[PDB]
């Protein structure tokens, strides 16, 4: 309830004119007050529409000011062009900045003038520095200047923040004012004709610098920001890659004193174990060279902080490192060219000096792993291998990007890259031919996509046809669904938390063992991911083919095999001007159904093969190896105690034993820590990388101005929890500026906190961070009922595509691969399901969402609507709340910190109740009926459809099950058992279980099975209504936790809930 005051001050500051007028609009769920709001509205518009002073009425209608709820504020203000400079000249009295063109290796990666690199606009491209966000730099500057203006009279630590950010913003505004501000077009692009006389990389530098200086709260933050902002203006290729590299060594220097553990059964369990840090001597010399590069690039204060920290190697000063490790990735992306980014990967050194003893074992281990994965389904003759074709055609992801193509649906032309639409096209013209796999050769090389991420290389993406997916689908699904019952993969270690993705950095650590951890992200072009990998899988397929007798399965397996045959020789379309290059690349990357598990397999075989060579010089027992695609760590335990020389020699042996296979590596051995791209542990404490650029994006999505405010707030929340903290007021300023909409050149509307923070399809943020909010009042109920009525909208483009011939044909062809006695129950169902993935096509989503926003605006302008009773969640919570009773409590501190970078209130909760004892309610459609259909088919009929289908007679249900391949005897047994009344109740239990509101970012981490939280929740037991008592206890926990987060103190609760309200609520439970 504070946002709106900052909104008012922002409006007053930005416009400032006599002509700038401000027009509230209100609402109330109470008839009389609502009609008085209507009145107020009318009279205000009239008075505005009559050149009368508006300031007189504002006293008379005090009632609206006290009890009504705000929606929005309108604004009539004229063009007033160029006001940014007219404000900004004062905050720019320092000296501007000069680039240094002789820093980056390439020529165009320097921050030189555009015209020196792009004389013609026809060859200009903003894609090498595109912020890719529908908000301007001028917007960012306006926000910064307003913040600076309002914080112009404070005298505290706040003033030290203001002086620091003022000096930084002076450096920035000095750099911009040297030339001026670029002006956005309607699309938020920056054309050639504005950037012609300015540096090419000024905008990204500006945005990133704003993001950094808005995240300054201390002196060391100021040092970091001044030392990165002045070098990120020139260096754009060797900065985040440089400073983020030493961290991998630093983790091997932090003594553990107190630890968190994880079980095989995936539960945290703290340990007071102490572990030293047996670091060798030569890695310090490496680290010094890295700091020498750091100083040689032009960094002075931040080497000083890393060198004076090593005098003590304490863990209390250590979050600084983590802080630094996050300050590197908030400088922007290194959006270089498709060509040179591919050539970062497409440099190869293949040699006739490697072993053969290694590759043969490698091939065999891959073979064996494949057989372990595939023994059960290949043998027991599973439907999904038999019906692999249909399985892949249902699971066609509708963003999949195979080969842009000119289509026509009746009377249109479409340039879709989506493979579902391509399949719809190819079914009609007789070209659908999944058994005949296309080649990938000179006659048909592959396109590319570009994956950028700061501090690392630009990675590449294959863009394949749609036959390869269909071939790979069934086998890879059985592989995943097997190996998540098994070690060595992220599918087994993943839900949200600690006790997961790693969960065994910290069992097998002491002064007996070590751990070798290794980044393997460059190992895609390597000589060990070519021929042996493919031939190993091919051999395994031969074994598995001889391990079955049915013929569709042999066909599917032979097609997967032939896919690996064709992918063994693979060329790559890349244009360059007029001519087209195609390069020999017979190796592995993503853009495939297979890449994750197969890379994990190959790395597993590789590390298992390497690890049988250290045994020639050491005695150890391998306790654990873990592989998640392109990373790997192995722990190993010894017959004796560890030394510095053994770690060093082991590292050299690892490096040279990879060198024997012509494989580059930075071998890293340690005792307490690891480092990988996204996270790391030091001293038995998990930190994380907070490298999510807010004001600069990777690529250009398809969302609106609106939703980008929500993504930016989500990234803010994440980065804040991770450690990187930005000023929340700035984020709110951006949200209002991005939800602002131009109805004309001079009319502009601004919504309020009570529209953006309400649970709907229009939610953007929350009134109190780290807490979703619900509604006990009339008013949230009112607007939620209103907005739920409006979420359901239409798309004429979708309507005409779904009314064409190819869509009908597609449903029919899907159908005819199965039985032919259901025509109005599933064909409509499959069409309704395909509709859920036609919306991926951007113009459909844009039509629907622009229509949705227009429907919103035609009740933001004029008064509001009651929406006719359509029930939602807050209706229920409104009835649950008035039988609670609070009392002040006092919990002690008995739980350990193991995520230091969190805010102190969240940590205080962790420091008073426990971290996660994880639970499960359903691992997907478990109840009675989908685990039969998923055994005889793959089809996934929606629970709406089942809730209807069970309500029908038992005859056409019997027909429907027989139509899905099932025999008659099991249907007869199902009807005789009388389970349909049970699966009504199980399905409605599953409907209440669909409430996903346990995992938003702060509820993600808290343990609700705690005894300390539970003794506060004194709700007596009634019985025979499990859903209600479940949700009541859950909701009471959420009340306690949210009060704790927002206020720190604790409370107890009590709900002597009447039986009458249990029953009155029971019918609204299992609806909506």
């Amino acid at each position: 309830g504070k946002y709106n005051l900052i909104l008012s001050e922002y409006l007053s500051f930005i416009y400032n004119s006599q002509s700038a007028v401000q027009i509230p609009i209100y609402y109330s769920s109470n008839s009389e007050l609502e009609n008085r709001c209507i009145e107020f509205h009318s009279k205000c518009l009239e008075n505005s529409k009559n050149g009368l002073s508006l300031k007189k009425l504002f006293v008379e209608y005090s009632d609206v000011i006290e009890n009504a709820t705000l929606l929005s504020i309108l604004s009539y203000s004229y063009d007033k062009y160029n006001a940014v400079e007219r404000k900004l000249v004062k905050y720019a009295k320092g000296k501007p900045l000069e680039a240094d063109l002789t820093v980056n290796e390439l020529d165009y990666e320097n921050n030189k003038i555009t015209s020196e690199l792009f004389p013609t606009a026809e060859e200009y491209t903003d894609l090498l520095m595109d912020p890719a966000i529908l908000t301007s730099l001028s917007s960012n500057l306006n926000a910064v200047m307003f913040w600076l203006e309002k914080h112009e009279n404070d005298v505290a630590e706040k003033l030290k923040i203001y002086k620091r950010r003022l000096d930084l913003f002076t450096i920035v505004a000095s750099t911009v004012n040297k030339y001026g501000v670029p002006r956005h077009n309607a699309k938020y692009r920056y054309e050639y004709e504005v950037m012609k006389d300015k540096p090419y990389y000024l905008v990204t530098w500006a945005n990133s610098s704003i993001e950094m200086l808005m995240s300054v709260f201390s002196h060391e933050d100021y040092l970091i920001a001044r030392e990165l902002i002045v070098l990120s203006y020139s260096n754009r290729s060797t900065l985040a890659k440089l400073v983020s590299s030493p961290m991998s060594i630093l983790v091997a220097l932090v003594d553990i004193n107190g630890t968190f553990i994880t079980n095989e059964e995936l539960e945290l369990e703290f340990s007071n174990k102490y572990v030293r840090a047996i670091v060798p001597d030569q890695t310090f010399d490496e680290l010094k060279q890295m700091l020498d590069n750091m100083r040689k690039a032009g960094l002075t204060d931040i080497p000083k902080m890393i060198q004076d920290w090593l005098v003590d190697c304490s863990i209390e000063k250590f979050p600084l490192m983590a802080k630094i490790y996050s300050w590197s990735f908030h400088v922007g992306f290194r959006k270089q060219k498709m060509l040179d980014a591919a050539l970062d990967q497409l440099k190869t050194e293949y040699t006739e000096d490697v072993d053969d003893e290694m590759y043969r074992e490698y091939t065999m281990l891959i073979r064996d792993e494949v057989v372990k994965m595939l023994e059960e389904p290949v043998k027991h003759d599973d439907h999904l291998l038999q019906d692999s074709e249909l399985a892949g055609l249902l699971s066609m992801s509708s963003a999949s990007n195979g080969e842009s193509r000119q289509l026509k649906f009746g009377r249109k032309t479409i340039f879709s890259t989506k493979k579902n639409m391509h399949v719809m096209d190819d079914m009609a013209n007789g070209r659908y031919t999944p058994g005949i796999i296309p080649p990938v050769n000179v006659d048909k090389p592959i396109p590319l996509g570009r994956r950028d991420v700061p501090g690392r290389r630009t990675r590449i993406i294959f863009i394949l046809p749609y036959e390869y997916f269909i071939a790979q689908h069934a086998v890879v699904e059985k592989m995943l669904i097997y190996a998540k019952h098994t070690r060595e993969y992220a599918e087994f270690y993943s839900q949200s938390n600690q006790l997961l993705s790693y969960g065994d950095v910290t069992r097998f650590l002491s002064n007996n063992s070590m751990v070798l951890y290794t980044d393997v992200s460059q190992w895609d072009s390597s000589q060990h991911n070519t021929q042996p990998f493919r031939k190993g899988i091919i051999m395994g397929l031969d074994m598995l083919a001889n391990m079955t007798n049915d013929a569709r399965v042999i066909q599917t397996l032979n097609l997967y095999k032939q896919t690996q045959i064709n992918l063994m020789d693979s060329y790559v379309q890349i244009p360059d001007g007029n001519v087209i290059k195609k390069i020999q690349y017979g190796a592995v990357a993503s853009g495939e159904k297979q890449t994750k598990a197969a890379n994990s397999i190959a790395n597993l075989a590789l590390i298992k093969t390497v690890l049988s060579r250290i045994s020639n010089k050491y005695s150890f027992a391998t306790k654990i190896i873990r592989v998640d695609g392109d990373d790997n760590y192995a722990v190993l335990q010894f017959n004796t105690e560890v030394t510095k020389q053994m770690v060093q020699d082991v590292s050299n042996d690892v490096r040279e034993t990879y060198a024997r296979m012509n494989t580059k590596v930075k071998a890293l051995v340690s005792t307490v820590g690891i480092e990988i791209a996204k996270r790391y542990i030091a001293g038995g404490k998990i930190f994380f990388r907070a490298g999510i650029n807010l004001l600069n994006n990777e690529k250009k999505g398809q969302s609106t101005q609106w939703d980008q405010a929500a993504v930016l707030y989500s990234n803010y929340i994440v980065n804040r929890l991770r450690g990187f903290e930005t000023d929340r007021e700035f984020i709110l300023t951006k949200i209002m500026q991005m939800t602002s909409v131009a109805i004309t050149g001079s009319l502009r509307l601004f919504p309020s906190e009570r529209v953006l923070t309400t649970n709907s399809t229009f939610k953007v943020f929350d009134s109190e961070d780290f807490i979703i909010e619900y509604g006990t009042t009339d008013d949230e109920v009112y607007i939620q009922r209103a907005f739920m009525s409006l979420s359901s909208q239409k798309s004429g483009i979708a309507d005409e595509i779904a009314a064409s011939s190819t869509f009908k044909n597609y449903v029919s062809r899907l159908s005819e691969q199965l039985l032919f006695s259901k025509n109005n129950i599933v064909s409509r169902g499959i069409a309704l399901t395909e509709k859920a993935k036609l919306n991926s096509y951007a113009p459909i989503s844009l039509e629907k969402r622009r229509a949705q926003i227009s429907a919103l605006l035609t009740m933001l302008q004029k008064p509001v609507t009651f929406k006719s009773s359509k029930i939602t969640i807050n209706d229920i919570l409104r009835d649950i709340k008035p039988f609670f009773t609070v009392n002040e409590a006092h919990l002690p501190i008995q739980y350990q910190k193991f995520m230091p970078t969190l805010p102190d209130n969240v940590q205080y909760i962790i420091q008073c109740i426990g971290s996660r004892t994880y639970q499960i309610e359903d691992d997907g459609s478990k109840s009675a009926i989908s685990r039969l259909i998923s055994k005889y088919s793959v089809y996934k009929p929606s629970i709406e459809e089942l809730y209807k289908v069970i309500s029908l007679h038992e005859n056409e249900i019997q027909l429907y099950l027989i139509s899905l391949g099932i025999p008659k005897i099991d249907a007869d047994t199902y009807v005789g058992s009388k389970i349909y009344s049970q699966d009504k109740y199980r399905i409605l239990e599953s409907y209440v279980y669909n409430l996903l509101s346990i995992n938003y970012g702060c509820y993600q981490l808290f343990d609700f099975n705690s005894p300390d939280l539970e003794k506060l929740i004194r709700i007596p037991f009634k019985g025979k209504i499990p859903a209600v008592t479940f949700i009541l206890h859950l909701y009471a926990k959420l009340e306690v936790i949210n009060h704790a987060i927002k206020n720190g103190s604790w409370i107890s609760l009590f709900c002597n809930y009447p039986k009458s309200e249990m029953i009155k609520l029971w019918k609204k439970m299992w609806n909506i």
Binding site: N887, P1020, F1021, K1022, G1023, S1052, F1054, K1059, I1063
Partner: protein, 99 residues
């Protein structure tokens, strides 16, 4: 004291209620709170000292009222209560707990 809420937790986990039943045990839980135990503790002593007689008001559908009335009628002499009140209490107890 024991808090009202934890005592109700113990009693409710004992009684094993049913949210879909018209039970003869929800009425036990009426008025268990403090500020009344205080009131009774204060009233008994004040009345026995001042020798002011004191009536009763109870609902025969509740059966913990009559069970605590047993203790009450034991530790307080019968003539301290007005006649019709304890007669109703005794009659209730004899009719629906004993015979």
């Amino acid at each position: 004291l024991v808090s009202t809420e934890a005592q109700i937790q113990k009693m409710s986990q004992d009684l094993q209620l049913e949210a879909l039943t018209i039970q003869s045990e929800t009425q036990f839980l009426t008025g268990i709170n403090s500020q009344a135990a205080n009131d009774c503790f204060k009233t008994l002593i004040a009345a026995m000292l001042s020798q002011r007689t004191m009536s009763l008001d109870f609902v025969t559908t509740n059966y913990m009222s009559l069970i605590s009335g047993m203790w009450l009628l034991t530790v307080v002499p019968n003539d301290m209560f007005i006649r019709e009140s304890l007669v109703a209490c005794q009659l209730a107890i004899i009719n629906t707990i004993i015979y």
